[PDB]
């Protein structure tokens, strides 16, 4: 996160930290006790699939406390339309080996219904993005969970307001600033773009890609979660398949 | 207007334009100056656009130059107050006033729903948590 | 389906209607950092009244966009700041009393679409010191002018001779649309 602030411990309870072989890999979003939504590109270079770990209730990566809970990721589901090294369909559904315990520091973000997300949430102007990603485009990552409020743009506006690169599909949407001051960044990939509406937060986006980080003339791009609600729900009701990695058809 | 021999009398705006309808020449015969006659004539001859009573639902019309402006009562909008504010209870309009989910229904009124972990209150619009840790709420802020 | 175009604001005394071409739509309005609000749902008119939305804060800058139906095709309107752009209506001379060598000319404090409590605020209520009125009066072949910060003029008159008056509502700080049209003429 470029240009944001530390999320006070406990005010970003659905945020997830993903680690491979103990190394920081990406962010994610808890949506119930056993499922986590993250970005598919986070897994393009994984080799030891039995070494993915999801940590909840994390905040400061330099201190350990009782709010932290770790779980092996039993399954990583990606749309079978996603292509490593490309931008479209950047989403993944992760099944934790064991459910996490819901506490004051670990709570799931609501997965909304498709139409509510399309016709209402899509027009709430600001949403929060968060992660332990880079603080500067060139820079190193953050030790404390960082959060940033960003305004959403309809795609026609995003393109018109951007310099002339992957295409913004209907499975994406832009959010942020083009003045070069605020954006999420690479290490924030897979983390939540959460929208607040009438007392409740809902998952509307996933940190996905962008030109550099907070590059002038560009906006961050996020997976448009409303297009995957049925996909995520059918899968969540599915039986655990052999092997960690699974590719499920989409639609 | 002009009646038999009235034009022998010097011009009088009251008698001819107020108490009567005066043409442009009678008006010019009064102000004499062209720029003055036009300034007077532009309004005098405009007409009252409110004549047709365009404002609906108890609105109040205010005439302008070749146009009007409708002032409406609270529950109305539109150029002519033709829009009923109390008839916009659909899901696309402010989420049907629902706290969470909104379902339109052709003919009848819209219904509101809630996400798992919540339940719809008796007001038909609000949702309340049924679990201790419902999704979307930040415990330490609650 | 084709995207609306030539979106134009038509505003006077704050009655604000968004118009467009060509002759099913839905309009959304917002301030640069507020949520988007839908208006004129699936209307087949090529216009939409937005008065109730903009009078909530006339000092704000709104942006509107017209969606089209047979993300949706849409077009943005120009930005619109009521207070700096709503056209002042045609004023009216309310009265003029003479007192010897002077004459008081009073301009009517016209109502606007801006609501506050159970009422409509006047043009004065909304602009305060920002609004002045100009007077153009004559008898003689020349014209004269006087300006005022209130809704009243106090001028000198040569006894006996007849006078005619006309007023204009003006907001001097303004760049564009700074003067209303001339009021109807009124004479003694
Ligand atoms: C999923 O696709 C991409 C993800 C990421 C890394 N993830 C990421 C996440 C968020 C943002 C940001 N919001 N500014 C920026 C970056 C990157 N950037 S990288 C090479 O440094 O890792 C690129 C991606 O697409 C290819 C591409 C090519 C050219 C221009 C744009 C995109
Ligand atoms: C009332 O009169 C006005 C002014 O000409 C007209 O435009 C309206 O449509 C009519 O109802
Ligand atoms: C004019 O204004 C409208 C708003 C209503 O008050 C009417 O009753 C009145 O005549
Ligand atoms: C991610 As872009 C379309 O603003 O360059
Ligand atoms: Ca820690
Ligand atoms: Ca006559
Ligand atoms: Ca006559
Ligand atoms: Ca007569
Ligand atoms: Ca008379
Ligand atoms: Ca004549
Ligand atoms: Ca005559
Ligand atoms: Ca004559
Ligand atoms: Ca008129």
XYZ file of C-alpha atoms and ligand atoms in Angstrom:
648
model
C 0.000 0.000 0.000
C 1.270 3.359 -1.205
C -0.078 6.417 0.547
C -2.181 4.666 3.159
C -1.943 4.184 6.908
C -1.606 1.369 9.447
C -4.926 -0.454 9.878
C -5.476 -0.376 13.669
C -5.052 -3.892 15.058
C -8.426 -5.607 14.791
C -10.085 -3.244 12.321
C -9.156 -5.402 9.283
C -10.173 -8.825 10.760
C -10.880 -10.605 7.484
C -7.452 -9.794 6.098
C -5.345 -12.870 5.458
C -1.607 -13.362 5.059
C -0.497 -16.120 2.643
C 2.983 -17.625 3.027
C 4.815 -20.292 0.989
C 7.636 -22.116 2.714
C 7.321 -19.529 5.479
C 7.877 -16.571 3.150
C 5.340 -13.763 2.653
C 3.501 -14.519 -0.601
C 0.199 -12.596 -0.838
C -2.896 -11.384 0.925
C -6.358 -12.923 1.043
C -9.837 -12.410 2.449
C -11.667 -14.726 4.869
C -15.350 -15.120 3.903
C -16.302 -17.812 6.437
C -14.419 -20.197 8.760
C -12.851 -22.422 6.109
C -12.724 -20.414 2.897
C -10.358 -17.688 1.770
C -10.533 -15.704 -1.463
C -7.258 -14.580 -2.947
C -5.736 -13.884 -6.371
C -4.913 -16.695 -8.791
C -1.683 -15.062 -9.952
C -0.365 -15.482 -6.439
C 0.171 -19.111 -7.375
C 1.873 -18.881 -10.783
C 5.234 -19.965 -9.364
C 4.350 -22.310 -6.517
C 6.267 -25.573 -6.449
C 5.670 -26.938 -2.928
C 1.864 -26.974 -2.852
C 1.941 -28.680 0.525
C 3.684 -25.624 1.898
C 1.018 -22.921 1.541
C -0.032 -21.416 4.903
C -2.838 -18.945 5.631
C -2.505 -16.768 8.752
C -5.450 -14.929 10.306
C -5.609 -12.254 12.978
C -2.122 -11.136 11.907
C -1.117 -7.441 12.189
C 2.528 -6.735 12.952
C 4.780 -9.294 11.294
C 7.534 -8.635 13.872
C 5.577 -9.673 16.943
C 3.620 -12.797 17.837
C 0.446 -12.714 19.875
C -2.542 -14.868 20.679
C -4.753 -13.406 17.988
C -2.803 -15.192 15.266
C -4.151 -18.434 13.797
C -2.461 -20.531 11.115
C -3.901 -23.080 8.781
C -2.516 -25.183 5.983
C -4.295 -24.490 2.719
C -5.838 -27.822 1.737
C -6.956 -26.659 -1.668
C -6.363 -23.833 -4.131
C -9.176 -23.535 -6.664
C -8.645 -21.337 -9.746
C -10.948 -20.807 -12.741
C -9.952 -23.063 -15.587
C -9.993 -19.933 -17.785
C -7.145 -18.305 -15.925
C -3.714 -18.235 -17.603
C -0.515 -17.860 -15.502
C 1.262 -14.675 -16.487
C -1.907 -12.953 -17.647
C -4.478 -10.763 -15.925
C -8.054 -12.047 -16.546
C -10.005 -14.082 -14.005
C -7.468 -13.253 -11.312
C -9.243 -15.143 -8.486
C -8.707 -18.205 -6.326
C -10.815 -19.918 -3.658
C -8.760 -21.530 -0.860
C -10.020 -24.244 1.499
C -8.258 -24.224 4.848
C -7.284 -27.620 6.284
C -9.017 -26.730 9.518
C -11.505 -23.995 10.279
C -10.336 -20.879 12.104
C -12.019 -19.745 15.344
C -13.994 -16.507 15.026
C -12.757 -13.950 17.612
C -12.623 -10.151 17.990
C -9.565 -10.197 15.713
C -10.689 -12.819 13.195
C -13.969 -12.267 11.374
C -15.137 -13.089 7.811
C -16.000 -10.388 5.240
C -19.417 -10.879 3.646
C -19.628 -12.348 0.137
C -22.626 -10.362 -1.267
C -25.289 -11.532 -3.705
C -24.453 -10.659 -7.313
C -27.240 -8.146 -8.032
C -26.818 -6.301 -4.698
C -23.100 -6.016 -5.518
C -23.800 -4.872 -9.122
C -26.675 -2.495 -8.569
C -25.755 -1.092 -5.152
C -22.203 -1.754 -3.854
C -20.758 -0.932 -7.251
C -21.854 2.667 -6.735
C -20.578 3.282 -3.201
C -17.608 5.436 -4.195
C -14.928 4.449 -1.678
C -13.722 1.087 -0.462
C -10.728 -0.046 1.548
C -7.768 -1.993 0.202
C -5.191 -3.522 2.480
C -2.132 -5.676 2.760
C 1.516 -5.887 3.818
C 2.721 -4.989 0.349
C 5.290 -2.485 -0.831
C 5.072 1.035 0.629
C 6.699 2.446 -2.539
C 6.833 1.162 -6.126
C 10.553 0.380 -5.818
C 10.456 -0.266 -2.049
C 10.206 -3.028 0.530
C 7.116 -4.389 2.212
C 5.354 -3.214 5.336
C 5.572 -4.789 8.811
C 2.182 -3.505 9.963
C -1.035 -4.166 8.098
C -1.614 -1.084 5.960
C -5.070 0.113 4.735
C -6.109 2.665 2.093
C -9.456 4.136 1.025
C -9.829 4.261 -2.792
C -12.556 5.545 -5.099
C -13.994 3.275 -7.794
C -14.277 4.047 -11.475
C -16.475 2.658 -14.204
C -14.286 1.193 -16.912
C -15.100 3.719 -19.620
C -13.796 6.406 -17.245
C -10.795 4.381 -16.222
C -9.628 4.043 -19.850
C -10.367 7.642 -20.711
C -8.445 8.814 -17.714
C -5.455 6.603 -18.272
C -2.353 6.869 -20.481
C -1.864 4.362 -23.356
C -0.888 -3.196 -21.351
C -3.576 -5.747 -20.487
C -7.125 -4.794 -21.361
C -9.616 -3.989 -18.595
C -12.194 -6.738 -18.967
C -15.706 -7.011 -17.661
C -14.159 -9.224 -14.959
C -12.184 -6.232 -13.638
C -12.668 -2.645 -12.478
C -10.378 0.228 -11.636
C -10.045 2.020 -8.335
C -7.584 4.572 -7.018
C -5.838 7.753 -8.107
C -3.934 8.680 -11.236
C -1.992 11.511 -9.645
C 0.661 9.051 -8.457
C -0.131 9.249 -4.734
C -2.168 6.242 -3.625
C -2.599 2.654 -4.763
C -2.251 -0.878 -3.483
C 0.872 -2.630 -4.780
C 2.296 -5.994 -5.875
C 2.665 -7.539 -2.419
C -0.945 -6.623 -1.708
C -2.094 -8.986 -4.455
C -5.073 -11.138 -3.461
C -6.036 -8.901 -0.597
C -9.561 -7.392 -0.169
C -11.158 -4.317 -1.728
C -13.907 -4.038 0.920
C -17.042 -1.910 0.572
C -18.964 -0.507 3.547
C -22.750 -0.282 3.159
C -25.372 0.446 5.785
C -23.392 -1.087 8.635
C -21.806 -4.000 6.808
C -18.645 -4.646 4.837
C -18.795 -6.776 1.697
C -16.096 -8.185 -0.595
C -16.244 -6.311 -3.944
C -12.683 -6.666 -5.164
C -9.340 -8.476 -5.067
C -5.999 -6.602 -5.448
C -4.916 -7.868 -8.867
C -2.684 -5.871 -11.161
C -1.739 -2.405 -12.388
C 1.071 -0.499 -14.118
C 3.759 -0.195 -11.479
C 2.344 1.087 -8.194
C 0.633 4.464 -7.930
C 2.007 5.342 -11.342
C 0.897 8.726 -12.684
C -1.765 8.299 -15.330
C -2.789 4.876 -14.016
C -5.194 3.288 -11.533
C -5.063 0.027 -9.643
C -7.101 -2.800 -11.098
C -9.089 -5.355 -9.134
C -10.865 -8.601 -9.881
C -14.588 -7.831 -10.086
C -15.873 -10.285 -7.470
C -19.527 -9.870 -8.453
C -18.861 -11.961 -11.567
C -17.704 -14.921 -9.493
C -20.302 -15.202 -6.757
C -22.076 -18.271 -8.208
C -18.744 -19.798 -9.076
C -17.472 -19.348 -5.511
C -20.715 -20.644 -4.000
C -21.004 -23.783 -6.080
C -17.351 -24.628 -5.152
C -17.803 -23.948 -1.454
C -20.521 -26.614 -1.469
C -18.276 -29.104 -3.262
C -16.497 -32.174 -1.941
C -12.684 -31.904 -1.379
C -10.849 -33.219 -4.465
C -7.461 -35.045 -4.313
C -4.428 -32.837 -4.793
C -3.930 -29.283 -3.604
C -4.470 -27.454 -6.902
C -7.852 -27.716 -8.640
C -9.103 -25.944 -11.827
C -12.862 -25.490 -11.937
C -14.745 -24.436 -15.010
C -15.908 -20.899 -15.322
C -18.717 -20.089 -15.886
C -56.141 49.724 -28.397
C -57.649 52.473 -30.521
C -61.302 53.520 -30.586
C -62.875 56.306 -32.665
C -60.900 59.565 -32.162
C -58.956 58.305 -29.152
C -55.705 58.859 -31.014
C -56.302 62.615 -30.818
C -55.248 62.188 -27.130
C -51.572 62.120 -26.193
C -50.199 58.673 -25.342
C -50.933 57.192 -21.914
C -49.431 53.888 -20.806
C -52.131 53.298 -18.197
C -55.101 53.900 -20.447
C -53.570 52.063 -23.407
C -51.333 49.275 -22.072
C -52.559 48.651 -18.527
C -56.300 49.319 -18.889
C -56.119 48.047 -22.450
C -53.977 45.934 -24.735
C -51.617 48.166 -26.668
C -49.869 47.273 -29.918
C -46.189 48.000 -30.530
C -46.835 51.336 -32.240
C -49.064 52.599 -29.430
C -46.235 51.570 -27.072
C -43.630 53.287 -29.230
C -45.966 56.308 -29.335
C -45.664 56.292 -25.556
C -41.931 55.795 -24.944
C -40.858 57.350 -28.259
C -37.311 55.993 -27.960
C -36.606 52.661 -29.690
C -34.376 51.083 -27.062
C -36.925 52.096 -24.415
C -39.889 50.694 -26.356
C -38.061 47.384 -26.860
C -37.137 47.128 -23.173
C -40.827 47.599 -22.323
C -42.099 45.454 -25.181
C -40.015 42.387 -24.467
C -41.898 41.744 -21.198
C -45.244 43.296 -22.052
C -45.532 41.020 -25.040
C -43.935 37.853 -23.635
C -47.164 36.188 -22.510
C -47.633 34.259 -19.257
C -46.234 30.758 -19.774
C -48.050 29.687 -16.614
C -51.401 30.230 -18.301
C -51.589 26.576 -19.277
C -51.279 25.654 -15.574
C -48.327 23.316 -16.120
C -47.381 22.608 -12.514
C -49.013 19.434 -11.219
C -49.866 17.950 -7.838
C -50.376 21.326 -6.242
C -47.217 22.934 -7.512
C -46.884 26.678 -7.903
C -45.967 28.204 -11.242
C -43.786 31.266 -11.608
C -43.701 32.855 -15.016
C -40.431 33.736 -16.757
C -39.373 35.015 -20.181
C -40.786 32.436 -22.604
C -40.668 29.793 -19.895
C -41.817 28.955 -16.392
C -40.550 27.324 -13.217
C -42.548 24.925 -11.126
C -42.138 24.992 -7.300
C -43.389 21.630 -6.015
C -44.675 20.214 -2.744
C -42.289 17.927 -0.760
C -43.418 14.632 -2.327
C -42.957 15.822 -5.902
C -40.223 16.512 -8.464
C -39.932 17.066 -12.180
C -40.084 20.089 -14.453
C -43.824 20.024 -13.828
C -43.928 18.299 -10.459
C -45.249 15.242 -12.310
C -42.937 12.898 -10.412
C -44.217 11.088 -7.334
C -41.422 10.591 -4.817
C -43.454 7.961 -2.929
C -43.613 5.778 -6.053
C -39.951 5.026 -6.462
C -39.759 2.030 -4.079
C -37.707 -0.215 -6.390
C -34.399 -1.999 -5.794
C -32.395 0.164 -8.181
C -33.484 3.256 -6.177
C -31.333 3.363 -3.028
C -31.457 -0.425 -2.676
C -35.234 -0.237 -2.155
C -34.469 1.198 1.231
C -33.301 -2.306 2.295
C -30.370 -2.676 4.694
C -28.931 -5.580 2.789
C -30.656 -7.449 -0.016
C -33.488 -6.154 -2.184
C -35.774 -8.127 -4.523
C -38.066 -6.293 -6.904
C -41.418 -7.862 -7.593
C -43.522 -6.989 -10.643
C -46.824 -5.466 -9.530
C -46.434 -5.758 -5.746
C -43.877 -4.055 -3.513
C -40.205 -4.930 -3.124
C -39.015 -7.365 -0.463
C -35.794 -7.102 1.553
C -33.455 -9.927 2.569
C -30.399 -10.538 4.749
C -27.118 -12.399 4.427
C -26.494 -15.671 6.316
C -25.804 -14.849 9.966
C -28.462 -12.145 9.949
C -32.249 -11.990 10.175
C -34.757 -9.476 8.823
C -36.420 -7.358 11.519
C -40.145 -6.707 11.804
C -39.704 -3.373 10.032
C -39.132 -5.437 6.879
C -35.945 -3.509 6.009
C -33.372 -4.092 8.771
C -31.101 -7.014 9.483
C -29.811 -8.140 12.842
C -26.993 -10.663 13.608
C -28.011 -14.141 14.647
C -24.461 -15.262 15.366
C -21.831 -13.799 17.664
C -19.461 -12.999 14.847
C -21.546 -12.118 11.783
C -19.625 -11.328 8.578
C -18.907 -7.693 7.822
C -18.856 -6.392 11.392
C -15.733 -5.207 13.193
C -16.068 -6.564 16.787
C -13.832 -4.004 18.493
C -15.792 -1.162 16.937
C -19.194 -2.642 17.786
C -28.458 1.247 -28.141
C -26.609 4.575 -28.404
C -25.002 6.638 -25.677
C -26.674 9.925 -24.851
C -24.808 13.034 -25.950
C -24.918 16.795 -25.699
C -25.818 16.597 -22.013
C -26.786 20.080 -20.869
C -27.739 21.726 -17.586
C -30.748 24.030 -17.649
C -30.844 25.835 -14.333
C -32.660 28.970 -13.062
C -33.167 29.988 -9.421
C -31.875 26.526 -8.762
C -34.578 24.587 -10.604
C -32.095 22.245 -12.288
C -33.048 19.883 -15.148
C -30.485 17.795 -16.957
C -31.295 17.457 -20.670
C -29.801 15.376 -23.458
C -30.124 13.597 -26.781
C -31.274 11.833 -28.864
C -35.089 12.235 -29.339
C -34.805 3.965 -22.081
C -32.451 5.841 -19.665
C -31.485 6.158 -15.995
C -29.559 9.070 -14.495
C -27.028 9.156 -11.641
C -25.756 12.249 -9.874
C -23.027 12.745 -7.281
C -20.452 15.145 -5.841
C -16.769 14.326 -6.569
C -16.476 12.173 -3.461
C -20.018 11.081 -2.664
C -21.905 7.968 -3.628
C -23.736 7.829 -6.936
C -27.497 8.342 -6.707
C -29.916 7.042 -9.306
C -32.674 9.332 -10.620
C -35.351 9.278 -13.310
C -35.508 5.488 -13.480
C -35.907 3.950 -16.886
C -37.467 7.176 -18.123
C -38.058 7.606 -21.853
C -37.749 11.376 -21.479
C -34.505 12.947 -22.589
C -34.473 15.143 -19.489
C -34.285 14.660 -15.724
C -35.094 17.007 -12.882
C -32.244 17.110 -10.347
C -33.388 20.091 -8.287
C -34.008 18.089 -5.082
C -30.558 16.607 -5.218
C -28.573 19.819 -5.909
C -30.368 22.129 -3.395
C -29.089 19.921 -0.544
C -25.818 21.821 -1.032
C -25.684 24.481 -3.737
C -22.017 25.264 -3.062
C -21.131 21.714 -4.129
C -19.972 20.638 -7.576
C -22.069 17.843 -9.062
C -21.452 15.486 -11.957
C -24.156 13.527 -13.653
C -24.156 10.690 -16.129
C -26.883 9.274 -18.331
C -27.086 5.487 -18.690
C -28.641 3.952 -21.815
C -30.657 0.745 -22.288
C -32.456 -0.727 -25.328
C -21.433 -2.042 -17.633
C -24.061 0.068 -19.491
C -23.398 2.649 -22.204
C -23.301 6.064 -20.639
C -22.116 9.617 -21.006
C -20.981 12.142 -18.398
C -22.460 15.627 -18.196
C -20.309 18.738 -17.620
C -19.544 19.429 -13.951
C -22.143 21.681 -12.341
C -21.865 24.054 -9.372
C -25.322 25.558 -8.690
C -24.295 28.674 -6.748
C -21.818 29.736 -9.437
C -24.009 28.794 -12.400
C -27.734 28.720 -11.774
C -29.281 31.524 -13.838
C -30.944 34.314 -11.878
C -34.583 34.607 -12.934
C -36.164 37.720 -14.442
C -36.581 40.138 -11.554
C -39.788 42.041 -10.797
C -40.211 45.597 -9.490
C -42.400 45.226 -6.382
C -43.117 48.909 -5.799
C -41.881 52.468 -5.896
C -42.947 55.138 -3.426
C -42.143 58.819 -3.860
C -41.312 61.124 -0.958
C -40.789 64.622 -2.266
C -37.490 64.719 -4.149
C -36.743 61.019 -3.643
C -38.231 57.729 -4.818
C -37.820 54.312 -3.306
C -37.730 51.479 -5.847
C -38.176 48.051 -4.321
C -37.156 44.775 -5.953
C -39.101 41.659 -4.984
C -37.141 39.091 -2.989
C -37.895 36.242 -5.426
C -38.084 32.633 -4.190
C -35.686 29.880 -5.264
C -36.015 26.088 -5.284
C -33.714 25.898 -2.257
C -35.657 24.534 0.683
C -34.865 25.128 4.353
C -37.344 23.735 6.844
C -40.930 23.985 5.584
C -39.973 26.845 3.272
C -38.313 28.141 0.086
C -35.327 30.443 0.562
C -35.246 33.738 -1.313
C -32.514 34.852 -3.694
C -31.248 37.081 -0.865
C -31.311 34.230 1.690
C -29.032 32.179 -0.592
C -26.437 34.713 -1.878
C -26.444 37.396 0.800
C -23.752 40.010 0.093
C -22.957 38.175 -3.142
C -26.053 39.589 -4.844
C -26.764 43.142 -5.920
C -29.480 44.733 -8.060
C -28.990 47.250 -10.808
C -31.447 49.942 -11.771
C -31.834 51.537 -15.182
C -34.240 54.471 -15.102
C -35.079 57.417 -17.372
C -37.596 60.288 -17.686
C -34.977 63.829 -21.146
C -33.081 61.468 -23.473
C -30.459 59.886 -21.250
C -30.332 56.884 -18.943
C -29.247 56.572 -15.373
C -28.194 53.724 -13.117
C -27.956 53.012 -9.452
C -26.838 49.780 -7.740
C -27.823 48.344 -4.361
C -26.720 45.667 -1.851
C -30.287 45.212 -0.605
C -33.540 44.956 -2.571
C -34.224 48.693 -2.536
C -33.150 51.778 -4.421
C -33.340 55.378 -3.159
C -32.948 57.868 -5.968
C -33.399 61.557 -6.690
C -36.174 62.670 -9.024
C -36.773 65.979 -10.758
C -40.241 66.991 -9.520
C -43.109 66.926 -11.991
C -41.496 64.805 -14.730
C -42.381 61.125 -15.268
C -39.898 58.260 -14.624
C -39.554 54.689 -15.906
C -37.602 51.902 -14.180
C -36.061 48.498 -14.955
C -33.933 46.245 -12.744
C -31.412 43.494 -13.131
C -30.328 40.918 -10.522
C -26.521 40.652 -10.567
C -23.867 38.559 -8.887
C -20.666 40.547 -9.584
C -18.094 38.054 -8.373
C -19.367 35.764 -11.126
C -17.465 34.955 -14.253
C -20.357 33.607 -16.390
C -24.148 34.073 -16.099
C -23.494 37.004 -13.843
C -26.597 39.005 -14.666
C -30.275 38.126 -14.863
C -32.397 39.385 -17.697
C -34.029 42.869 -17.434
C -37.254 43.085 -15.436
C -40.533 44.329 -16.984
C -40.540 48.111 -17.323
C -42.442 50.162 -14.750
C -43.246 53.889 -14.835
C -44.760 56.430 -12.445
C -2.003 -10.347 -12.389
O -1.239 -9.500 -13.246
C -0.231 -8.671 -12.755
C 0.137 -8.587 -11.391
C 1.273 -7.826 -11.015
C 1.608 -7.679 -9.542
N 0.383 -7.376 -8.722
C -0.060 -6.043 -8.535
C -1.187 -5.781 -7.749
C -1.679 -4.491 -7.684
C -1.053 -3.438 -8.409
C -1.529 -2.054 -8.181
N -2.797 -1.873 -7.785
N -0.895 -0.905 -8.508
C 0.074 -3.723 -9.216
C 0.556 -5.001 -9.269
C 2.029 -7.179 -12.036
N 3.128 -6.376 -11.722
S 4.629 -7.095 -11.335
C 5.312 -7.521 -12.914
O 5.531 -6.174 -10.762
O 4.401 -8.292 -10.556
C 1.649 -7.232 -13.364
C 0.514 -7.973 -13.712
O -0.001 -7.996 -14.984
C 0.834 -7.735 -16.099
C 0.954 -6.296 -16.442
C 1.831 -5.916 -17.422
C 2.006 -4.596 -17.746
C 1.302 -3.616 -17.084
C 0.418 -3.989 -16.097
C 0.249 -5.329 -15.782
C -48.258 25.334 -20.375
O -47.762 26.521 -20.962
C -46.370 26.312 -21.072
C -45.638 27.553 -21.550
O -45.745 27.637 -22.967
C -46.047 25.124 -22.017
O -44.634 25.048 -22.427
C -46.533 23.876 -21.290
O -46.141 22.648 -21.948
C -48.041 24.035 -21.091
O -48.587 22.952 -20.321
C -47.168 27.484 -4.309
O -46.061 26.692 -3.857
C -46.277 25.294 -3.841
C -44.978 24.648 -3.325
C -47.405 25.040 -2.861
O -47.060 25.687 -1.670
C -48.704 25.711 -3.293
O -49.766 25.433 -2.301
C -48.434 27.239 -3.457
O -49.555 27.916 -4.062
C -4.288 -0.278 -15.043
As -4.578 1.205 -16.205
C -5.909 0.787 -17.519
O -5.042 2.533 -15.372
O -3.189 1.486 -16.950
Ca 2.257 -10.992 14.115
Ca -54.540 53.867 -28.470
Ca -57.373 53.600 -26.307
Ca -60.308 52.343 -22.706
Ca -56.164 52.426 -14.438
Ca -47.983 55.928 -34.516
Ca -51.814 56.350 -29.097
Ca -51.732 55.557 -32.649
Ca -43.646 35.096 -19.476
